[PDB]
Amino acid sequence: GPKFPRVKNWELGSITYDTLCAQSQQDGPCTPRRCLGSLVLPRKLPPAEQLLSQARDFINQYYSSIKRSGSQAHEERLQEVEAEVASTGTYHLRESELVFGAKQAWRNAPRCVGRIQWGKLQVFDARDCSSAQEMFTYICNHIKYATNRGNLRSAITVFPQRAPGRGDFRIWNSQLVRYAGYRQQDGSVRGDPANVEITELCIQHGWTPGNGRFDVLPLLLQAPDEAPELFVLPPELVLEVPLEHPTLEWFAALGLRWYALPAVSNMLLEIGGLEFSAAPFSGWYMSTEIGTRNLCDPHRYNILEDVAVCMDLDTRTTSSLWKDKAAVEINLAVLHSFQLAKVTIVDHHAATVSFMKHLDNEQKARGGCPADWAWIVPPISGSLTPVFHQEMVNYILSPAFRYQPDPWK
Amino acid sequence: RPPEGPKFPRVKNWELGSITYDTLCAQSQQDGPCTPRRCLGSLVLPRKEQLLSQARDFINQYYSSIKRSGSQAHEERLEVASTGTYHLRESELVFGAKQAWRNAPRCVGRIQWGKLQVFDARDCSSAQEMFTYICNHIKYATNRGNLRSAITVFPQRAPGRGDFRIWNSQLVRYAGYRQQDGSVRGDPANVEITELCIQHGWTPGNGRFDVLPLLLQAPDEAPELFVLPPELVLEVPLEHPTLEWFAALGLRWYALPAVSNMLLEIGGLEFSAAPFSGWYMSTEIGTRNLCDPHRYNILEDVAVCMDLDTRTTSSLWKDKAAVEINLAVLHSFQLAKVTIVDHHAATVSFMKHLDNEQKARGGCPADWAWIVPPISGSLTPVFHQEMVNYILSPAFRYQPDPW
Ligand code: HEC
Ligand code: HEC
Ligand SMILES: CCOC(=O)N1CCC(Nc2cc(C)ccn2)CC1
Ligand SMILES: CCOC(=O)N1CCC(Nc2cc(C)ccn2)CC1
Numbered sequence: 001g002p003k004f005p006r007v008k009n010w011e012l013g014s015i016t017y018d019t020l021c022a023q024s025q026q027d028g029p030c031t032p033r034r035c036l037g038s039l040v041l042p043r044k045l046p047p048a049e050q051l052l053s054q055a056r057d058f059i060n061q062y063y064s065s066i067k068r069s070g071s072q073a074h075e076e077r078l079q080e081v082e083a084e085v086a087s088t089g090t091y092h093l094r095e096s097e098l099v100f101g102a103k104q105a106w107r108n109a110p111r112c113v114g115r116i117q118w119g120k121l122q123v124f125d126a127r128d129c130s131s132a133q134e135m136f137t138y139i140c141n142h143i144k145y146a147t148n149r150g151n152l153r154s155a156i157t158v159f160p161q162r163a164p165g166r167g168d169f170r171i172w173n174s175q176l177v178r179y180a181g182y183r184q185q186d187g188s189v190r191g192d193p194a195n196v197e198i199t200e201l202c203i204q205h206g207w208t209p210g211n212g213r214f215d216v217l218p219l220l221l222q223a224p225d226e227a228p229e230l231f232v233l234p235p236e237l238v239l240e241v242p243l244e245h246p247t248l249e250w251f252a253a254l255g256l257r258w259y260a261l262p263a264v265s266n267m268l269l270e271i272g273g274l275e276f277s278a279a280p281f282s283g284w285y286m287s288t289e290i291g292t293r294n295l296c297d298p299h300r301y302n303i304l305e306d307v308a309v310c311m312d313l314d315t316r317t318t319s320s321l322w323k324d325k326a327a328v329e330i331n332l333a334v335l336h337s338f339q340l341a342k343v344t345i346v347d348h349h350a351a352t353v354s355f356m357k358h359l360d361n362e363q364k365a366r367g368g369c370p371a372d373w374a375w376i377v378p379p380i381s382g383s384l385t386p387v388f389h390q391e392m393v394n395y396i397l398s399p400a401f402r403y404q405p406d407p408w409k
Numbered sequence: 410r411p412p413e414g415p416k417f418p419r420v421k422n423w424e425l426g427s428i429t430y431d432t433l434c435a436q437s438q439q440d441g442p443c444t445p446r447r448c449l450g451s452l453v454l455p456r457k458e459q460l461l462s463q464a465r466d467f468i469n470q471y472y473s474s475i476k477r478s479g480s481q482a483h484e485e486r487l488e489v490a491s492t493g494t495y496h497l498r499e500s501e502l503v504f505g506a507k508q509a510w511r512n513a514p515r516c517v518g519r520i521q522w523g524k525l526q527v528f529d530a531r532d533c534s535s536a537q538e539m540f541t542y543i544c545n546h547i548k549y550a551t552n553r554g555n556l557r558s559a560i561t562v563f564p565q566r567a568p569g570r571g572d573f574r575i576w577n578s579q580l581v582r583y584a585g586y587r588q589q590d591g592s593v594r595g596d597p598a599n600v601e602i603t604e605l606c607i608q609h610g611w612t613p614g615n616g617r618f619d620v621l622p623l624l625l626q627a628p629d630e631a632p633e634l635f636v637l638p639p640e641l642v643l644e645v646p647l648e649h650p651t652l653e654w655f656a657a658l659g660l661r662w663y664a665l666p667a668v669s670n671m672l673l674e675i676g677g678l679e680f681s682a683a684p685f686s687g688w689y690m691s692t693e694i695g696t697r698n699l700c701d702p703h704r705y706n707i708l709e710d711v712a713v714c715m716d717l718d719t720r721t722t723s724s725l726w727k728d729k730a731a732v733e734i735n736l737a738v739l740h741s742f743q744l745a746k747v748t749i750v751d752h753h754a755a756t757v758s759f760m761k762h763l764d765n766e767q768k769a770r771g772g773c774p775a776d777w778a779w780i781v782p783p784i785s786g787s788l789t790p791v792f793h794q795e796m797v798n799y800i801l802s803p804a805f806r807y808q809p810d811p812w
């Protein structure tokens with residue numbers, strides 16, 4: 001009936017219609033002829049006709065959230081954003097506006113299953129930062145605050161925006177905490193295979209390696225129109241959790257571990273047409289990210305076999321589900337270890353349940369929620385999760401967090 | 410080296426770093442549900458002269474396949490005239506059926522598409538005749554445990570009269586008896602079909618695994634009940650390799666997965682009743698059929714028996730229990746000598762299939778959410794493979810229930 005997408009939950013039988021997608025101002029990669037919903041990346045790599053359009057949209061969005069849409073303040077602010085843009089080609093956001101955009105960005109992130117927390121975000125303004133040494137100080141303050149000795153707090157630090165005729169502020173690392181990936185002579189990799197390239201760039205910019213499997217990397221912080229600079233994170237700020245299993249004594253002997261703080265640092269924060277090329281954000285890990293992807297992906301630590309081997313499992317055949325049995329124990333070890341270390345973490349069952357709650361909330365608040373099924377469903381025990389059975393509608397909303405081309409090349 | 414842009418979509422594999430481009434989607438003639446505004450790829454069902462063309466495309470396609478295109482025949486072949494419709498030759502039907510399966514985006518078992526036994530039953534005119542055909546289909550495909558892929562095609566649709574239909578969603582499914590308190594004895598998924606069977610005069614059972622009778626319908630007539638010969642339905646008692654008490658659960662499952670409620674579309678013609686079968690992927694039984702909250706829902710029970718801590722999610726009792734149930738299935742089928750493939754082998758073979766199809770047609774339509782299995786998603790190779798989804802003809806599609 002309704003001229004809007006009908007989404008069904010196959011478990012509860014319930015139905016809803018998405019009206020939120022109508023506000024989308026950015027096109028996706030799908031077409032009536034073919035769905036490219038599975039692709040990780042759409043496919044690629046500041047005027048007034050178009051910037052002004054995005055700014056007002058954002059401004060309306062903001063006045064509407066404080067329930068003062070169409071008021072005097074609203075009208076004046078609009079006039080104001082046109083004034084600044086016409087005489088300079090760009091414009092600045094108010095503090096309160098920045099806090100709103102940041103939270104909306106997380107809120108709008110289709111791939112994030114932890115959005116029930118979108119409201120509890122600590123925004124740190126660092127739009128006043130003017131050097132790499134300053135970027136590094138903000139960053140450590142961020143980590144200290146977010147880590148909070150185990151009781152993690154979601155936070156984002158927003159550095160200065162882009163301005164034509166000038167280089168952006170950038171963090172070369174994909175995360176604030178990454179383990180080194182050392183290419184070996186035999187062609188293998190010591191450390192995290194994912195970070196081979198960033199590890200190599202650090203060594204070039206004067207960093208001295210170390211053949212460990214979990215050596216925290218330095219940060220390559222870049223201030224406008226200047227070569228990056230190396231900064232070593234003070235060990236005491238980087239909280240880590242050595243891994244051990246609740247009943248398998250040998251697990252601890254594997255010498256495995258992981259850091260508590262998941263802080264993405266390479267994405268672009270876009271608000272009202274403004275681009276914050278450096279805006280690291282952090283929350284707390286969902287156990288499957290560590291115990292399934294980071295540790296079990298063939299191209300990552302790839303430990304399944306090592307673990308199935310201690311378990312005395314028939315690794316000679318797929319039908320023995322050795323891979324499945326091993327992955328579960330590994331995921332359990334991660335959960336047992338964080339809880340043992342009093343470091344915040346959420347399992348995939350709890351996360352997905354709370355994500356379903358988030359959907360209902362969003363339905364009443366915005367009439368919908370952009371969600372990327374393939375990312376909302378956990379990497380293990382997919383259908384044992386409630387979100388598996390939930391049909392989702394994916395679209396692009398702003399404010400948004402987006403991908404941006406790497407600094408180097 | 411690779412198209413960039415939207416024309417031919419680049420597809421990447423994140424485990425290997427390999428990249429390819431899909432040129433096959435250009436042959437799509439049917440729009441899906443996605444828009445540049447919002448992707449609806451996760452929905453399960455569509456919100457919801459032309460013929461003469463759909464049927465030349467098929468004929469060309471068929472003639473190009475036998476390496477005999479643009480000749481005399483193909484040309485000569487390209488009834489709609491004085492009838493408004495037309496009929497396919499048998500060899501053409503076999504080719505079309507094989508292609509429908511080949512183009513199914515949600516089937517991870519497509520490595521097997523060339524190996525399909527096609528049964529032509531377009532000459533049925535009674536529910537009775539459908540039954541005999543179906544019985545022979547089950548027998549052939551089961552082949553005493555060494556399962557064979559098979560499809561039986563019934564009379565196409567004729568604009569004007571009713572459709573030949575098989576009311577059941579599957580040729581073999583277990584009855585679901587509701588029984589005041591509000592619980593189901595059997596398969597909750599089959600309450601409706603069970604009730605309809607009783608309504609149509611079937612004497613119910615009183616078991617957790619009573620095989621359901623078939624409700625077969627010839628055009629414009631009320632369906633007719635038929636009871637499958639017990640000797641025809643090969644089942645498999647479930648038990649675990651080490652958990653001795655598992656067999657005590659008294660669980661079991663049938664060996665043959667035969668879909669019967671879909672519509673087969675070939676060259677514009679629609680075959681409303683075309684049951685098709687293959688063999689199971691262990692996780693369909695062990696995860697969906699047995700663990701799903703609205704199916705046999707044995708998850709908790711098994712966890713408690715295993716003495717897991719079901720008080721908190723964090724103990725991962727659901728995860729552990731699910732794996733053991735999946736293993737039980739694989740163990741039971743192997744022990745019983747009945748064909749079946751685990752999600753690891755099937756997806757490994759599907760990856761091969763993708764390579765093949767790339768050399769063969771420059772791509773392969775695939776639905777990621779369905780290719781990746783319901784458990785252990787990222788421990789499977791397909792998880793890290795990007796996929797393109799679009800519709801090709803021939804194709805299998807949903808149709809409304811006959812009631
Ligand atoms: C409160 C704890 C929290 C949890 C648990 C959480 N997030 Fe996210 N999250 C994202 C974005 C953006 C993505 C999508 C990443 C992409 O598209 O590359 C994401 C993705 C994810 C993923 C998917 C990873 C994958 O590859 O499958 C998980 C799991 C996740 N978030 C969990 C922004 C955030 C922000 C930003 C202010 C915060 C805080 C945040 N997320 C907090 C959290
Ligand atoms: C050779 C053994 C074989 C295996 C293993 C196999 N198939 Fe499929 N398969 C389909 C179609 C059509 C679908 C998609 C069903 C839908 O969209 O409702 C499918 C879907 C599936 C699914 C996804 C189920 C889900 O809900 O996640 C699995 C797993 C599968 N097939 C496995 C037609 C076939 C045909 C028909 C000629 C044959 C034979 C066939 N399939 C043989 C096989
Ligand atoms: C596009 C590449 O994305 C990634 O590598 N990742 C996706 C995003 C990220 N995970 C996160 C981030 C947060 C803030 C909390 C929990 N988990 C790190 C892994
Ligand atoms: C752009 C860099 O991208 C990456 O490093 N990755 C991109 C994809 C990433 N995660 C995924 C992928 C899917 C399909 C579902 C959940 N999570 C694995 C690593």
Ligand SMILES: CCOC(=O)N1CCC(Nc2cc(C)ccn2)CC1
Nearest residue numbers: 666667668685686687688689690693
């Ligand atoms: C749209 C809903 O589809 C289904 O419920 N089903 C369709 C898919 C079916 N599985 C199958 C089918 C075959 C032919 C072989 C192995 N597995 C399970 C039943």
Ligand SMILES: CCOC(=O)N1CCC(Nc2cc(C)ccn2)CC1
Nearest residue numbers: 010388389390451453454778779780
């Ligand atoms: C229209 C009939 O639908 C159904 O019977 N079902 C609906 C969905 C079906 N399978 C699914 C669903 C997903 C999301 C992925 C793989 N397989 C299982 C039950």
Ligand SMILES: [Zn+2]
Nearest residue numbers: 030035443448
């Ligand atoms: Zn799509």
